Symmetry: D2
C-alpha cells in the first residue's frame, strides 16, 4: 500500500466516511490521465488504491470530493474539492499517506512520506 488517504471531519469530530476521491497521473502529453479511485471507509481511510509496481515515478493528483460529502450532511461548502498535487517516487519508492482535515470553509492536506 504505497498510497493511502485519511480524511477527518472537523465539524463532527469523526472520520469522514464515504468520501469519494479520484487519482490522476500526468501523462506524457501533459494531461491528467485517470489512475485510481475509491471511497473512504468507516475509519475515514482509503487503502488499496495502487501497488508498488503500478505506482511509478510521476506527478499525481488526488481530487477528494469534499463538496458531495458536505452536501450529504446538509452543508453547502466553499470548495469544489480538496486537491493534492505531488511528484512521487523520484528519489526511489516511498510510501505516502495523505491526511485531509475538512471544514466547510477550510481544509488542510498533509503528507507523511516514509522510506
Amino acid at each position: 500500500c504505497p498510497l493511502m488517504v485519511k480524511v477527518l471531519d472537523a465539524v463532527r469530530g469523526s472520520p469522514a466516511i464515504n468520501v469519494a476521491m479520484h487519482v490522476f497521473r500526468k501523462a506524457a502529453d501533459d494531461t491528467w490521465e485517470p489512475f485510481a479511485s475509491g471511497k473512504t471507509s468507516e475509519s475515514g481511510e482509503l487503502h488499496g488504491l495502487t501497488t508498488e509496481e503500478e505506482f511509478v515515478e510521476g506527478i499525481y493528483k488526488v481530487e477528494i470530493d469534499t463538496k458531495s460529502y458536505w452536501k450529504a450532511l446538509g452543508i453547502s461548502p466553499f470548495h469544489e474539492h480538496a486537491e493534492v498535487v505531488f511528484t512521487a517516487n523520484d528519489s526511489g519508492p516511498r510510501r505516502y499517506t495523505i491526511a485531509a482535515l475538512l471544514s466547510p470553509y477550510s481544509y488542510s492536506t498533509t503528507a507523511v512520506v516514509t522510506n
Copy 2:
C-alpha cells in the same frame, strides 16, 4: 499595536465576532498573572490589547473562549478554549495571532514582523 489576535470561523466562512479572550503573563511563581483582555470586533480582530512599553519579555498565554462561540451557534464543540502560549520580547516585536475555529479542531498561527 504590539499584539493583535484574529479569529475566523471555518464552518461559516466568516470572521468570528464577539469571541472573548484573556491574556495572561507567567509570573515568577509559575502562576498566570492577568495581563489583557477583550473580544473580537465585527472583523474578527482584537486590537489594542497592550502597548510597546507594557509588553515586555515573558511567557504569555492567550486563552480564547471558543466554547461559548460554538454554544451560541448550537454546536457542541470539543475544546473548552484555545490556549496560545508563547515567549514574547529579543526586544520588542509585533505579534499577530490567528486562530481558525472548527467545532472539533482549531489551528493557530503566529506572524512576527517588523
Copy 3:
C-alpha cells in the same frame, strides 16, 4: 476588490512574499480558461486580481506556486502547488482566500463577507 489572496509561511512566521499564482475560470468544455494572475506583496497579499463586473458566476481555480517558494528557501516540499477550486457568484460576493504554507502541509480557508 472581489477577490483577495493572502499567503503565510508557517515555518518562518511571516507573510509569504513573492508567491506567484494564476487564477482560472472553468469553461463550458471543462477546460481552465486564464482569468487572473499575480504575486504576493511584502504583506503576503495579492489584491486587484479582478473587478466586480468581471468576476461573474463560475468555477474558479487559484493555483498557487508553493513549490517555487520552498525551493528558494532550500526546502524540498511535498506539493507541486496549492489548488483552491470553488464556485463563485448568488450574485457578487467578496472572497478572501488564505493559504498557510508548510513544506509537507498546507491549509486554505475562505472568508466570504459583505
Copy 4:
C-alpha cells in the same frame, strides 16, 4: 485505550517522534492535577496513557511539548507547547484521538471522538 495522541511534523512530512506530553485533570479545587504522561513512538503515536476505569468524567488538559521537539531539530519555534483542553466522558465513556499537526509557527489540534 480511551485516549490516544498522534503528532505529525509538517516540515519533514513525518510522524513527530519522541515528543513529550503531559496530561492533567482539573481537581475539585480547580487546579490542574497530574494525570499521565508519555512520549510519541516512531509512528508519532502515544498509546496507553490511561484506562477506561481511570479516565473518568472531567476536564483534561494535554500539554504537548512542541518547543523541545523543534529545538532538537535546530528550530526555534513560536509556541511553548500545543495544548488541548476538553471535557471528557460527560455523555458516557468515549474514545478520544487527539491529532496534532506541527509547524514552527503554527499548529492545529483535532479530536476524533468515537462511541
